[PDB]
Amino acid sequence: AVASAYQRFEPRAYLRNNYAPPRGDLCNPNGVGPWKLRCLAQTFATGEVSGRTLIDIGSGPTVYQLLSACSHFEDITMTDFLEVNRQELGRWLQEEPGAFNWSMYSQHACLIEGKGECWQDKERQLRARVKRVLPIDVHQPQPLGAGSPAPLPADALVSAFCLEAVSPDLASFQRALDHITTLLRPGGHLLLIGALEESWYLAGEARLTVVPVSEEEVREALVRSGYKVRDLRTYIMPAHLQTGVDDVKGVFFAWAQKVGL
Ligand SMILES: Nc1ncnc2c1ncn2[C@@H]1O[C@H](CSCC[C@H](N)C(=O)O)[C@@H](O)[C@H]1O
Ligand SMILES: NS(=O)(=O)c1ccc2c(c1)CNCC2
Description:
By secondary structure, the protein is an alpha/beta fold. Helices cover 33% and strands 24% of the residues. The strands form two sheets. It has a seven-stranded mixed beta sheet with strand order 3-2-1-4-5-9-8, with helices on both faces.
């Protein structure tokens, strides 16, 4: 019944808590922001993660996780359980009033990538390759998609801070991973980012209870679901980034392959 708590989820508060200074201050190279974008950028740059269709699971109200991705997939589908979030994304996609400002992130993605691209072009490219924002539920064996417009099976998947924040225990976690994995073409690639050893995090009046997982638990989970773990890294949270919006201990990044056998 996490969903019950997620009913009170405030997008603007979530964004403010996790993507605005200090955590949203990309100037310092030792912060999470740089780190996250760096993991994402290096991965796609290897050129091994490519295709036509890609799906972002539990996008929430954020778009940074697709910044380096849009360069490699022409059809991008973003998703999220809450309508509030799908709407918050819409504001940015259609450049509506009050949309969130992702400039710092677009810019840094451009710096790390090194193609001399300007942030305006990357944002316009991402906006262009995002075809639709679909509701989803990782708890359903068929992720809230009876007959979804989304091209299946997607060529790749990306998920940031979703699974561990929507499942109450390690098993819900494991099963949810199984659910989304079905959406992925064999030989496909998964890019997973999430909290390490986190039990709660706020979001306005919403106070989410979550499953504290370790790098090892994540690895085992990926393996159980049939992935070869291509790359798995962890960022330990510095004291200055440890605010009162949660109790994260670190952030992990995983690059996995749906092993076709
Ligand atoms: N059953 C479910 N299946 C999938 N997503 C769910 C869900 N219940 C809640 N969510 C979504 O879980 C997300 C957790 S926060 C996710 C973080 C976001 N991807 C980022 O990178 O910042 C929210 O957008 C929330 O609405
Ligand atoms: N500081 S951060 O940008 O790396 C980040 C992003 C999302 C979430 C957390 C932390 C922790 N709680 C889940 C949401």
